[PDB]
Nucleic acid binder design. Sequence first.
RNA 1: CAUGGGCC
RNA 2: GGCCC
Length: 476
Amino acid sequence: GLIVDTRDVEERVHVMRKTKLAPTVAHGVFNPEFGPAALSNKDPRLNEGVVLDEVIFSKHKGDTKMSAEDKALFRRCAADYASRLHSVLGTANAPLSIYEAIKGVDGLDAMEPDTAPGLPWALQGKRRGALIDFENGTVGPEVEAALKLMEKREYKFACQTFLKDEIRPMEKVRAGKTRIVDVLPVEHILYTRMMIGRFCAQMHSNNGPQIGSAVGCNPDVDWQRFGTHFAQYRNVWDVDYSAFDANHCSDAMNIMFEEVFRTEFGFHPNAEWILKTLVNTEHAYENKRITVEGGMPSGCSATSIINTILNNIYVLYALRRHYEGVELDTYTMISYGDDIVVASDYDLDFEALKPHFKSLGQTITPADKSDKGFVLGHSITDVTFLKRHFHMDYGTGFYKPVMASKTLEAILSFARRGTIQEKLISVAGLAVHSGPDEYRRLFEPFQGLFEIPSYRSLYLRWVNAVCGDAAALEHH
RNA sequence: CAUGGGCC
RNA sequence: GGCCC
Ligand SMILES: [Mg+2]
């Protein structure tokens, strides 16, 4: 987005801190090129002479404006896509009762219990439950107050900026390119889950190539459902986006919301409103009060769906912007946020699509750095979706999510205070697809120190997951 | 025990 | 809690 003004206020949101991620016994054995994100602008690991505050807000390269012509084209690609979407899901998007918006419904889980309630609840020393009954299903004073403020759209707000304490590649670590989270006020998140919470639930339960959404899938079983699909087309593309979230032009955002959340589809007149507020946002990074126009507050309710939807419309908008008579069924794709996998028998030319995407402020590049230029012929067994490859299991000829050993070496090398054992269990199910060998090697440094799930146990579990029949039938 | 949403 | 976005 475009930073209109960087003013300095009196208040100051304290975010500075250290990482809770401590090295593990695996570190000294692997020494991965990954490490905790620089949470301090004075961190020695940072290149001598790099303002952490400078990089954090360098993602905003401006809010690309669109010509009425392209706006009409986008509006059509939006209304068109919105047709296929709302067709499958349906038009039962009635406001989710405050109760349902808390406890969650079929598909939509429940609002996190003890998480940053955002502002101004954070400047008054209060927790999430200190304003809402996460045990019951209702809210209190503050909520009901703003709840009535949004009911009349009189409501206004701000976003609290946090430094996502995670593990990242040492290169971007020294580059002070630590990722940040835009924590919005809990009240907002609750209202959004009421306005379109119904919608999201339906999308989650219908993830797939049809609606081009992977939000709600289970890489363990859906990989087999997806793999076959893309391994059916001629060309498979794995596009990448540079600051996908922060580069959503206002015109593309407002048109999308106005097209995908109309009242004719059953949405509440405030569903479109509540979302449009996400355009012009005001961040509160410590003592500074930065204002931005455009982009997406990576950390708001249904933030992934909004991105997934946009990503879907961009592909259609771009293709039509370069070709003629291009319909949805002209190609096939699936995405989870910025991540995306495109496929189409047609020998499309993404390389000549870059500018068309740029007309939206988005910059696409080939996943495979080699010969920076979208080529052709690539199969599903080459692309990487959700940090996972598409490989076949010699044991059952099934498709299974496989993560690069280096990525696994980064995960098993760090962990917070007292979580190793538990983490080993979780991550264990992820390395089961790396094969017996790689598996035993990934947890070798923990033998006798922790309980390591046998490759056997988890393998048989997966088999029953991907296809309950594939397992039982192997008894006859 | 930094967030929205998966998912396990 | 862990991973993914
Ligand atoms: Mg990709």
